Every structure is written in C-alpha cells, then in structure tokens.
Design a protein around this motif. Structure first.
Motif, PDB file in Angstrom:
ATOM      1  N   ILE A   1      17.208  11.002   0.572  1.00  0.00           N
ATOM      2  CA  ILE A   1      16.986  11.408   1.951  1.00  0.00           C
ATOM      3  C   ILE A   1      15.636  10.833   2.368  1.00  0.00           C
ATOM      4  CG2 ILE A   1      17.077  13.314   3.617  1.00  0.00           C
ATOM      5  CD1 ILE A   1      18.398  15.033   1.653  1.00  0.00           C
ATOM      6  N   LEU A   2      15.464  10.625   3.675  1.00  0.00           N
ATOM      7  CA  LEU A   2      14.247  10.016   4.189  1.00  0.00           C
ATOM      8  C   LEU A   2      13.733  10.821   5.377  1.00  0.00           C
ATOM      9  CD1 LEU A   2      15.547   6.305   4.463  1.00  0.00           C
ATOM     10  CD2 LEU A   2      14.872   7.450   2.348  1.00  0.00           C
ATOM     11  N   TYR A   3      12.468  10.584   5.727  1.00  0.00           N
ATOM     12  CA  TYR A   3      11.804  11.199   6.875  1.00  0.00           C
ATOM     13  C   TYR A   3      10.393  10.629   6.960  1.00  0.00           C
ATOM     14  CZ  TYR A   3       8.930  14.246   3.931  1.00  0.00           C
ATOM     15  OH  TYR A   3       8.030  14.732   3.012  1.00  0.00           O
ATOM     16  N   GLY A   4       9.750  10.856   8.103  1.00  0.00           N
ATOM     17  CA  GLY A   4       8.343  10.570   8.254  1.00  0.00           C
ATOM     18  C   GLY A   4       7.927  10.497   9.709  1.00  0.00           C
TER      19      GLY A   4
ATOM     20  N   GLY B   1       0.781  -1.216   0.000  1.00  0.00           N
ATOM     21  CA  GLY B   1       0.000   0.000   0.000  1.00  0.00           C
ATOM     22  C   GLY B   1       0.815   1.271   0.000  1.00  0.00           C
ATOM     23  N   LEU B   2       2.074   1.201   0.427  1.00  0.00           N
ATOM     24  CA  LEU B   2       3.029   2.290   0.315  1.00  0.00           C
ATOM     25  C   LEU B   2       3.919   2.146  -0.909  1.00  0.00           C
ATOM     26  CD1 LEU B   2       5.892   0.880   1.500  1.00  0.00           C
ATOM     27  CD2 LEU B   2       4.666   1.216   3.659  1.00  0.00           C
ATOM     28  N   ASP B   3       3.636   1.166  -1.775  1.00  0.00           N
ATOM     29  CA  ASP B   3       4.466   0.935  -2.953  1.00  0.00           C
ATOM     30  C   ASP B   3       4.692   2.212  -3.751  1.00  0.00           C
ATOM     31  OD1 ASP B   3       1.805   1.097  -3.667  1.00  0.00           O
ATOM     32  OD2 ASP B   3       1.995  -0.308  -5.344  1.00  0.00           O
ATOM     33  N   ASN B   4       3.699   3.107  -3.784  1.00  0.00           N
ATOM     34  CA  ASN B   4       3.890   4.424  -4.384  1.00  0.00           C
ATOM     35  C   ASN B   4       5.116   5.122  -3.810  1.00  0.00           C
ATOM     36  OD1 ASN B   4       3.591   6.941  -5.612  1.00  0.00           O
ATOM     37  ND2 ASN B   4       1.377   7.026  -5.267  1.00  0.00           N
ATOM     38  N   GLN B   5       5.386   4.921  -2.520  1.00  0.00           N
ATOM     39  CA  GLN B   5       6.564   5.507  -1.897  1.00  0.00           C
ATOM     40  C   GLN B   5       7.837   4.770  -2.304  1.00  0.00           C
ATOM     41  OE1 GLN B   5       6.285   5.530   2.344  1.00  0.00           O
ATOM     42  NE2 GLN B   5       7.705   7.240   2.623  1.00  0.00           N
ATOM     43  N   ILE B   6       7.803   3.437  -2.307  1.00  0.00           N
ATOM     44  CA  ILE B   6       9.008   2.681  -2.640  1.00  0.00           C
ATOM     45  C   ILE B   6       9.212   2.591  -4.152  1.00  0.00           C
ATOM     46  CG2 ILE B   6       7.987   0.377  -2.683  1.00  0.00           C
ATOM     47  CD1 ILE B   6      10.453  -0.684  -1.354  1.00  0.00           C
ATOM     48  N   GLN B   7       8.136   2.627  -4.949  1.00  0.00           N
ATOM     49  CA  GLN B   7       8.322   2.623  -6.397  1.00  0.00           C
ATOM     50  C   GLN B   7       9.056   3.875  -6.855  1.00  0.00           C
ATOM     51  OE1 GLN B   7       4.259   2.359  -7.672  1.00  0.00           O
ATOM     52  NE2 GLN B   7       4.046   4.558  -8.076  1.00  0.00           N
ATOM     53  N   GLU B   8       8.924   4.972  -6.108  1.00  0.00           N
ATOM     54  CA  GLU B   8       9.813   6.112  -6.295  1.00  0.00           C
ATOM     55  C   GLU B   8      11.265   5.690  -6.099  1.00  0.00           C
ATOM     56  OE1 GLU B   8      11.767   7.825  -3.848  1.00  0.00           O
ATOM     57  OE2 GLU B   8      12.559   9.011  -5.518  1.00  0.00           O
ATOM     58  N   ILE B   9      11.607   5.260  -4.882  1.00  0.00           N
ATOM     59  CA  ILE B   9      12.971   4.839  -4.582  1.00  0.00           C
ATOM     60  C   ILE B   9      13.336   3.530  -5.263  1.00  0.00           C
ATOM     61  CG2 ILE B   9      12.654   3.397  -2.540  1.00  0.00           C
ATOM     62  CD1 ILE B   9      14.936   4.705  -1.212  1.00  0.00           C
ATOM     63  N   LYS B  10      12.374   2.868  -5.914  1.00  0.00           N
ATOM     64  CA  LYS B  10      12.682   1.673  -6.690  1.00  0.00           C
ATOM     65  C   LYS B  10      13.765   1.964  -7.719  1.00  0.00           C
ATOM     66  CE  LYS B  10      12.042  -2.622  -7.934  1.00  0.00           C
ATOM     67  NZ  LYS B  10      12.628  -3.705  -7.097  1.00  0.00           N
TER      68      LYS B  10
ATOM     69  N   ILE C   1      22.184   7.185   1.807  1.00  0.00           N
ATOM     70  CA  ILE C   1      20.825   7.208   2.332  1.00  0.00           C
ATOM     71  C   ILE C   1      20.869   7.925   3.675  1.00  0.00           C
ATOM     72  CG2 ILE C   1      18.795   5.846   2.910  1.00  0.00           C
ATOM     73  CD1 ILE C   1      19.710   3.648   1.201  1.00  0.00           C
ATOM     74  N   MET C   2      19.952   8.868   3.881  1.00  0.00           N
ATOM     75  CA  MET C   2      19.915   9.638   5.117  1.00  0.00           C
ATOM     76  C   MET C   2      18.471   9.828   5.551  1.00  0.00           C
ATOM     77  SD  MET C   2      22.830  12.509   4.208  1.00  0.00           S
ATOM     78  CE  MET C   2      22.964  13.218   5.845  1.00  0.00           C
ATOM     79  N   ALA C   3      18.248   9.856   6.864  1.00  0.00           N
ATOM     80  CA  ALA C   3      16.906   9.999   7.403  1.00  0.00           C
ATOM     81  C   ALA C   3      16.940  10.723   8.740  1.00  0.00           C
ATOM     82  CB  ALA C   3      16.217   8.644   7.591  1.00  0.00           C
ATOM     83  N   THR C   4      15.906  11.526   8.974  1.00  0.00           N
ATOM     84  CA  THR C   4      15.518  11.949  10.310  1.00  0.00           C
ATOM     85  C   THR C   4      14.015  12.191  10.289  1.00  0.00           C
ATOM     86  OG1 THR C   4      15.911  13.512  12.124  1.00  0.00           O
ATOM     87  CG2 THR C   4      15.956  14.392   9.883  1.00  0.00           C
ATOM     88  N   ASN C   5      13.335  11.822  11.374  1.00  0.00           N
ATOM     89  CA  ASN C   5      11.883  11.942  11.401  1.00  0.00           C
ATOM     90  C   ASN C   5      11.407  13.357  11.693  1.00  0.00           C
ATOM     91  OD1 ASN C   5      11.264   9.213  10.804  1.00  0.00           O
ATOM     92  ND2 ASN C   5      11.639   8.638  12.941  1.00  0.00           N
TER      93      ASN C   5
ATOM     94  N   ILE D   1      11.690  11.086   1.261  1.00  0.00           N
ATOM     95  CA  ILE D   1      10.467  10.290   1.201  1.00  0.00           C
ATOM     96  C   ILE D   1       9.503  10.744   2.289  1.00  0.00           C
ATOM     97  CG2 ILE D   1      11.655   8.316   0.182  1.00  0.00           C
ATOM     98  CD1 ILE D   1      10.614   7.887   3.688  1.00  0.00           C
ATOM     99  N   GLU D   2       8.247  10.969   1.912  1.00  0.00           N
ATOM    100  CA  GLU D   2       7.206  11.275   2.884  1.00  0.00           C
ATOM    101  C   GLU D   2       6.542   9.974   3.317  1.00  0.00           C
ATOM    102  OE1 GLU D   2       3.723  11.063   2.997  1.00  0.00           O
ATOM    103  OE2 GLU D   2       3.703  12.081   4.943  1.00  0.00           O
ATOM    104  N   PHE D   3       6.533   9.708   4.623  1.00  0.00           N
ATOM    105  CA  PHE D   3       5.919   8.493   5.142  1.00  0.00           C
ATOM    106  C   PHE D   3       4.480   8.787   5.537  1.00  0.00           C
ATOM    107  CE2 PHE D   3       6.333   4.225   6.842  1.00  0.00           C
ATOM    108  CZ  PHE D   3       5.277   4.162   7.729  1.00  0.00           C
TER     109      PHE D   3
END
Lengths: 341, 689
Positions: A131-134, A97-106, A236-240, A259-261
C-alpha cells in the motif's frame, strides 16, 4: 488432410455466430443466441468441450446450427483499459535520497518473479503486496518507483472507483473483470491511483447511495480478500489521505507495507534538481544551490517544473540555454504559482 | 534585416566587392544568413568566376554544404586548404566539417584505393579533440593504420571515456557489426594505449581476443610491478586457453622472476584457495543427498543418482559412502562411478592418489579404467598419473587398456595443453592406428587431441588430423565415428582467425553426406562468430537441406556465432517442424543466467512427447539455472508421473545442483540418442569450477 476437405461441406457453405449459454450434462449444449435460438452439440472436433464454458460465444451451422468452432474475441473495453504496454523510459535511479523508502519496496518489487528463492527457502510466504501514501499530492514520484517496476513482469495502473460510480451498480463488476483478467494476465501487477472513494464525495452522472459506493469498495477488498484466490497480480494501492479509507483494508492486505513519503529536504532538492537541468544548459551565473537553498517546502514536481518557465522565454528567444537572471525572475511566476495559486 | 541591401552584391563581378562582401558574409555566417540560403539559384552562376578566390571557395562550400551535395561539397575545402570554442567554429567545423568531411571520407574511402583526406582527417581529429565529445567523432573516424595514429594521437589525458566508452562500444560493435581485420587494429593500438594505462584486465581481455604470448610476459612484469594477486591468477587461468599457459610456463620456466607465477599461472593456485573456502562460506545440507539421493532405484536412475550425488561438490562424503553401491553398478556406469570419485574432488592432489588407489588396478577393467579417468578428472598439473596408464595403453585390438586409453587419453586431454604436446600424440598414432570397435577410442582420440589442439595458431592441417582424415575415410563403419572424428577435426580448426582449412578439408574430404557432414562440422567450427551475415544467409539456404543432420550441427552453430548479440538469438526454430531443429534451439538457450523469455521457451519445450527431446529439455533447462528452480523439475514429475525421461529428470536435477573449455563438451554431448556406453563418456563435459 482429407478431413479438411471433408467437414468443410458440413461447415459449408457459411456458419453463424452463436452465444454459448448452458449445457445438458450429456454435452448437448443449450444456447441462447439471436434470437434465443438453441441447439444440441456433441461434436468430436476442436473441443475442448469442457473449457468453452457457459457465458461465451460460439459459431453455428445453418443446417442445423452445430457449433464447429469457437473464438476468444476482444478488443472490448475489458482488455483495452489494461494496456498497452508500456514501460516508459524512467528508472528508479531518478529519485535519490529516498532509497530508504524504495529499498523497502525493493524486496517487494524484486522478490516476486526475480530472485524468488529466498522467499521459498525461508518458506514464510510474504506475498502480501504493498500500500502507498504520502503528502501532499504524491504518487507520481511513486510512479517514478512504478516506472521502474516495468522492468519486470507486466503492469496496469487504474484511477479510482469511477467506473462504478458512473451508474447504479453494475456492482463492482467492471472491477471484478479487471481483477480476474489480471488472473488471465497472471503473473502481473495492478495499481489504483489515489483512492478517492469516500475521500471525494459527489459523483459524476448518477450514483447512490453511500452504502452501494461503500460496498463496491468493501467488495473490492472482499473480492481481493479473497475466497480463495492465490492469483497475483501483486496489488499496489495508494491514496494520499490515510483518513478516509476503511482501516480494515490493511489486515488482509497489504498488511506489512504502506510507504511514508517524506517531503524533500535541502540536499534532496539538490539531488533532485540537477537531474532536470542536466539536459537544459545553464548560463554561467546559474547555480542550483542558492535558489532552492533559500526556498522551503517545495515539491519534486515544482522543482522539475520550475525549469519550464525558462523553457518559455529562452525558447521564445529560441535559445538552448537557461539564464538565471530569468530563472530567478521567472521563478517568481512559479513562486507566484505556489504563493497566490 | 531585409535582403534588399545585401542581396544584389552577388550581381557584380568586381574583385573588391567580393573581397569585402565575403568577410561581411563571414560575420553573418554565424547563422549562415537570415534564413535557409535562397541566394543559391542566383549565385550558382558565379561558379565559373576565378585573388581571394579561396574565400570564394569558402562561400561556395558554405552554400553547397548549406543545401545539399555528396561530392562537390568538400571539393572547395580540399581546394581551399582551410586557412584564415565558438558558435561559428561549431558550425563550419562541427556539423559542416563533421558531415562534409564524413562524406568525403566515405566517398573517397569507397572511391579511390589521397594524402589530402589524411591531412583533413587529422585536422578534424584535432578539432574534435578540441570539442572533446568523443563517441560520434570516433565511430565516424573508424571507417577511415588511421585509427592507430588516431588513438595514440588522441590518448593523452582522458582514459575512461576512450577506454570504457570507445573500447566498449567499438569492441562490442566491432565484434557485432564490423568484420574481423580492423578488430586486430583495435586490439593492437588498444594494446598500445592500454599498455600506457593501468587496470590490466582491459589488456587481459585484449589477451582474450588476441591470444598473444608477448602480452602475458608484459602483463606479468607489469602485474608483478603492481603487487588481488592470486585472484588475477584465478581469472588469468580461467581466461587463458590451452596454449599460453604452457608457453607461459616454459618462458616463465626460464625466467619466473619470483617463481610465484610458476606457482599461480600454470595450475594448483586457481584451485588451492577455493575448495577450503568453498567448505567455509557455504553450508550445504544432507536432505538432497538423502532426498534427491532417495529418488528410488533401478540401476540407471540409481546409477545416475550416484552421479548426481557425486557431483555434489559438506565434505567428500558421497565419495567415501561405504560399499555395495558400485557393486550394484554395471560396466559403463562403473566407468561413470569410478570417475565419479574424480568428479567429487577436482582438487586434493595428494588425496586423489590415496582415494583412487583402492580403485586403481582393481579386479574390474571398468574400475581401473574409470579410475585413471578419475585421475585425469581431478587435476591438470600432476602429469605423474600418465605413466601407470600411459604404459599400459597398447592392446593392438580390443583389450582392457584401450578402455584405460579412453579414460586416460581423455583424462590426459583434461590434463595438458602445450604449445603442441607431441609425445602424447605419438602415443595417439597407435591409438587411431589401433582403431578399436569401441567408439570412444577414436572419440577421445579426436576430442582429446582437439583439447590439446584448440587454440592452435590459426589451426593447422598437420599430419595428426590429416592422418585421422585419411584413416577416417579408410573405414566407413559406425557413423558415430563419422560424427565424433569431425568433432576433434573442428577442435583443431579452433584457434582460427582466417583459416582456409574449410577449403582444404573441402578439397580433401567431401563426398557422400558422412564427409559432407564432416564439411558442415568444419563449416561450424571454423566460423566462431563476427559481423559476417553472409554465412547466416548461407545458414538460411542450406538450413533447408534434405539431409537432416547437417541441419542439426549447421543450425546448431548459432549459439557459438551470435552469443553476444543474443536478442536476435530468439528465432522461430520452435515454429519449424524438423523436431531436431527444436532440439537445436533447445541447445541454443544453454546455461547462462537465462531470462524469462528463455524459460518462456521452456514453457513449450518443456512439453513434448518424444523421449529424446523430452530428454533433451531438462539438460539445458537446468544448465541455464545453476518454487522457482525446482518448479519445472516437479513439473517434469507431472510430465512423466519413460526410463529415459526418468534419466533426463535426474540429469535436470544434476543441472539444478568464448572460453573453449565450456565450448567443447556439450557439442561432445550432441549425439545423446544412443547407448549408455556413450553415456559412460557423458560425464566428461567438465565445464564448471
């Protein structure tokens, strides 16, 4: 053949361990090794006289102290913290259901290494990383993305700038090697989980002031900027919390992706839940829908961990089967965990 | 509760205490007892005691099955004749009857060779049809045909679990671990249940492993019964071997039922949709003709470039690009360029005659002989190009038409695969009886009659290849003959399932290591691959043989053998030192999709200094990939910048841009360290659409 039985006497009987330091450009190598003992070695074998390089170790004769051979020795905290290996068994088919999010980073996880051609057939060069976040606490669901990225190349996950804040700089330097040992492992991937740098304030041990912690993050990007580094290590980098980061980190990289979670919706919770209870056998009256249908604003971790409470009492009775009469009633405990805790 | 009330009940020998205690123990047999059955040391004395003594057999198999035994455990069940969806049924049926009946089937399957284990085996089969989790019950009940009545007994409702799960894991593990003779039972009873079922390419892969002629008639009355259609004509013709399209076109030449299977399933209709649609959905530019066709000159690299340009197929442009390019060309490269118009156009039947016709019967022997070679390249169903070449062939020692014999015996080997075409082989008797000093006469004799003869009915030791054995051992000269004649020998050995022809040619043939190299060629080709590791430890020992060319082909058999379980296919052949062995692994990667470990082996194999091995790397290197792709190519430009290496680079560029048809021509390529006269046939490894 005979050379092996010839120079073993020159090597013989023992040989020391030196520290390779500096060179006379004539290739007489001045070394400082315990205690600060030098030498001059232009010797013909095993070198590779160039690449042994300053700032390394050597192995010296007793009479007189010629380096006849060299090693690369680690171990060390350097290589140990990057590995090993792993590739845990989880996949990107776990989160639906979040594939829209991972198909981006796919394409972002695919195009480097696998399927490289249309990068260079377009020739537009998008190796900018991610970069990541959510909200609220996420990034293990992005580890559920990262656990899938283990199918390709090699990866390291790091947490925070903590190794710098443990003491007065020390610079970035432990990040520097972690950055340039990824060049030693290039191609690879490196990720830092939930940057707390100025998000969190106080430090463990001794640290200060703000600017030295500000610049060790400022140098983190400026080393990654970089002058002038092709090396990947796709970053790859992330902070919420999108707030505390210096916004200038985006433009050099990663520019294109943060990425928006999205929080789970009703059917996403349905899509997520059964993956857990697939293994845990439910009783007759147990139903996925009604419970999570009435409950609102959950987390994938909770909806995964709500099954563990039944993994107590049913396992306290040593039963392979979940019971909704408990799973309802026990959910109050995890409900009490979110409500009162 | 405590064992104080229930434990001294084993002490009396009165019948009523047993005949009510054992139903009382049956109620507690849902968990066996309170614990791990420490009644054993006291109740094993009760063995010699003899009404409801089969219930005592149930207690006895219950407790002996409860702790541990391998043969005495199912003895109370075979004495018991089990009598009198539950948790208790999962206990005494599932784990106890599965493991206990499993060790009875293993112990009597290895021991004796009764009907009792057949009845118990069908009963456990029925009980696991009740339990409905296959996979483990299936793979247990393989090792007891039994599996036949197991499948037709089991297959009523569930189709894709037995088909996909069972036939996937047991097909893969049956070719992987299991020896060959039970795979026939897989294929025949799978022909039964898949004959019941739809989605016919399961039965067509049964035709892949079976090679049966009744199957294609059944799947054409059934796949005409299910009217895509030309697409299963396409992977029908791709899937089929040399025999069954000629047997198919003769029995369907009789019946045909719509004649559209005579249209599709011989030739010309695998190929009529592709080439226009190849032009349509793809749009290939011109700067590799000009750039990759610009890579300088030298009548070799340039000559190779003509081949590279020629195998471009956006039209047959490089075919009709003027004149003075083939006039720069020389003899065996003139064979390669006269055949190159064959290579641009493996379709356009009517256009093939009207393009090659200018180069037919020309002033040059190599133009006309490579021209008929091109006619053999372009198609396989025309057979009207035979007679202008076929008529000429006889020269009686070494005139022109023997080179047309090379291109036309080879190209007619490209052309047809009958039940046994015999007329072309009666033409082949004055060919081997001719025996020109040109190698590729007997070369394309053996290879072409092998292409006729691959897929023979467990091979044959017939007077064709028997004749080329005796006429082979007639003349011990030009050892390329002693290499490429066992090529076509082993090609006629292909089609085997159980052939003793290695023992037959072992008795007839073996001698000084020319014909012991023939022995290792038949040893290679007779052993396509199964779970048969005894020849892999034979491979381990005779791999260390001091003659280092039976090492070459004998170790080269590996990519034929373990092609499916390819994770073991990485070996330490690069860690060895007999440089042709590094050549062997360099072959053994090959052409499939080629993962990062394979290109990682091309990290070291890319860097070597001998020009036959540095020549040997870009061929399979760019076969395995049909910047990224061009990154090792420009790396080869960094390697050299000899002439061989330049040629190798050109070959790599050409590469950049168990079906037997892709199995033959690279083992035909395995003697590459030689003349360009040999490389005049280098362009006959036609393994790609």
């Amino acid at each position: 053949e005979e050379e092996r039985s010839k120079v073993d006497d020159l090597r013989g009987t023992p040989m020391s361990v030196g520290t390779l330091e500096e060179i006379i450009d004539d290739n007489h190598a001045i070394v400082s090794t315990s205690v600060g003992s030098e030498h001059y070695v232009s010797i013909l074998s095993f070198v590779d006289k160039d690449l042994l390089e300053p700032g390394c170790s050597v192995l010296l004769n007793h009479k007189v102290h010629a380096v006849i051979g060299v090693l690369m020795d680690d171990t060390d905290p350097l290589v140990t913290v990057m590995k090993v290996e792993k590739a845990p068994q989880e996949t990107y088919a776990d989160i639906g259901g979040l594939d829209n999010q991972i198909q981006e980073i796919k394409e972002s996880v695919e195009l480097p290494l696998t399927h490289p051609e249309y990068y260079e057939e377009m020739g537009i060069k998008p190796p900018k990383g991610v970069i990541l976040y959510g909200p609220p606490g996420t990034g293990k669901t992005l580890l559920a993305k990262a656990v899938a990225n283990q199918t390709s190349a090699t990866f390291l996950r790091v947490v925070g700038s903590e190794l710098i804040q443990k003491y007065l700089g020390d610079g970035p330097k432990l990040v520097r090697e972690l950055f340039r040992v990824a060049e030693e492992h290039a191609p690879s991937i490196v990720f830092i989980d939930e940057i707390d740098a100025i998000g969190t304030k106080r430090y463990d041990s001794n640290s200060g002031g703000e600017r030295e912690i500000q610049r060790t993050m400022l140098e983190l990007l400026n080393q990654l900027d970089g002058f002038d580094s092709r090396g990947d290590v796709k970053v790859i980098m992330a902070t919420n919390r999108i707030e505390t980061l210096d916004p200038a980190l985006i433009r050099p990289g990663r520019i294109d992706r943060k990425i928006e979670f999205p929080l789970p919706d009703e059917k996403t919770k349905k899509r997520i839940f059964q993956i857990h209870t697939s293994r845990m056998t439910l009783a007759d009256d147990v139903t996925l829908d009604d419970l999570i249908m009435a409950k609102d604003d959950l987390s994938g971790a909770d909806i995964k961990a709500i099954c563990t409470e039944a993994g107590l009492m049913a396992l306290r009775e040593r039963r392979m089967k979940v019971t909704n009469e408990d799973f309802k009633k026990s959910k109050e405990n995890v409900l009490y965990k979110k409500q009162e805790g | 509760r405590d064992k104080a009330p229930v434990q001294p009940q084993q002490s009396p020998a009165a019948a009523p205490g047993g005949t009510d205690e054992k139903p009382s123990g049956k109620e507690r047999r849902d968990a066996g007892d309170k614990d791990k059955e420490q009644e054993l040391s006291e109740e094993d004395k009760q063995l010699q005691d003899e009404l409801y003594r089969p219930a005592l057999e149930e207690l006895r198999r219950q407790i002996r099955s409860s702790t541990t035994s391998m043969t005495s455990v199912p003895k109370p069940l075979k004495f018991l004749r089990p009598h009198y969806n539950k948790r208790f049924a999962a206990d005494i049926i599932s784990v106890l009857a599965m493991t206990m009946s499993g060790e009875r089937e293993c112990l009597k399957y290895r021991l004796v060779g009764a009907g009792e284990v057949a009845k118990e085996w069908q009963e456990l089969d029925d009980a696991e049809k009740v339990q409905r989790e296959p996979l483990l019950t299936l793979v247990k009940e393989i090792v007891p045909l039994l599996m036949e009545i197991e499948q037709v007994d089991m297959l009523e409702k569930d189709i894709d679990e037995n088909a996909y799960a069972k036939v996937c894991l047991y097909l893969t593990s049956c070719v992987n671990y299991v020896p060959e003779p039970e795979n026939s039972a897989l294929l025949r009873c799978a022909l039964g249940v898949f004959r019941k079922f739809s989605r016919f390419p399961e039965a067509l892969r049964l035709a892949l492993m079976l090679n049966d002629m009744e199957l294609v008639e059944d799947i054409f009355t059934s796949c005409k019964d299910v009217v895509m259609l030309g697409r299963h004509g396409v992977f029908l013709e791709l899937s089929e071997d040399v025999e069954e399209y000629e047997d198919l076109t003769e029995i369907m030449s009789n019946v045909q039922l719509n004649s559209n299977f005579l249209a599709l399933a011989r030739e010309l209709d695998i190929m009529e949709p592709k080439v226009p649609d190849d032009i349509y959905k793809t749009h290939l530019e011109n700067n590799r003709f000009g750039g990759s066709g610009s890579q300088v000159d030298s009548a070799r690299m340039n000559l190779a470039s003509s081949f590279v340009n020629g195998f471009v197929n956006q039209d047959k442009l490089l075919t009709d690009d003027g004149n003075k390019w083939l006039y720069k060309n020389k003899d065996h490269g003139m064979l390669s360029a006269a055949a190159s118009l064959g290579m641009i156009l493996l379709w356009d039947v009517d256009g093939g005659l009207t393009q090659i016709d200018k180069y037919l019967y020309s002033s040059e022997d190599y133009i006309k002989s490579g021209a008929l070679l091109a006619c053999g390249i372009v198609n396989s169903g025309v057979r009207n190009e035979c007679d202008p070449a076929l008529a000429l062939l006889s020269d009686y020692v070494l005139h022109n038409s023997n080179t047309m014999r090379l291109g036309s015996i080879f190209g007619l080997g490209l052309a047809y695969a009958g039940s046994n075409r015999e007329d072309v082989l009666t033409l082949l008797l004055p060919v081997m009886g001719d025996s020109k000093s040109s190698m590729e006469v007997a070369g394309v004799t053996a290879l072409a009659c092998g292409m006729i003869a691959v897929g023979s009915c467990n091979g044959d030791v017939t007077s064709t290849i028997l004749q080329t054995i005796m006429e082979k051992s007639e003349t011990e000269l030009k050892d390329t003959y002693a290499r490429w004649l066992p090529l076509g020998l082993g090609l006629n050995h292909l089609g085997k399932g159980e052939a003793i022809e290695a023992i037959l040619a072992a008795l007839e043939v073996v001698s000084e290591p020319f014909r012991s190299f023939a022995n290792t060629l038949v040893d290679v080709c007779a052993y396509a691959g199964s779970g048969n590791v005894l020849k892999v430890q034979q491979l381990l020992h005779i791999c260390s043989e001091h003659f280092d060319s039976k090492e070459k082909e004998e170790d080269k058999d590996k990519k034929e053998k373990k092609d499916k379980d390819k994770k073991e296919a990485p070996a330490d052949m690069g860690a060895h030192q007999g440089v042709a062995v590094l050549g062997i692994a360099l072959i053994a990667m090959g052409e499939e999709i080629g993962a990062e470990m394979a290109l990682r082996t091309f990290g070291h194999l890319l860097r070597y200094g001998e020009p036959t091995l540095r020549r040997a790397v870009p061929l399979a290197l760019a076969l395995i990939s049909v910047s990224h792709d061009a990154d090792p190519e420009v790396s080869y430009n960094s390697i050299f910048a000899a002439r061989l290496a330049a040629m190798l680079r050109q070959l790599a560029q050409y590469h950049a841009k168990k079906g037997t048809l892709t199995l033959c021509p690279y083992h035909s390529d395995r003697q590459l360290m030689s003349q360009v006269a040999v490389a005049g046939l280098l362009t006959v490894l036609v393994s790609f659409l």
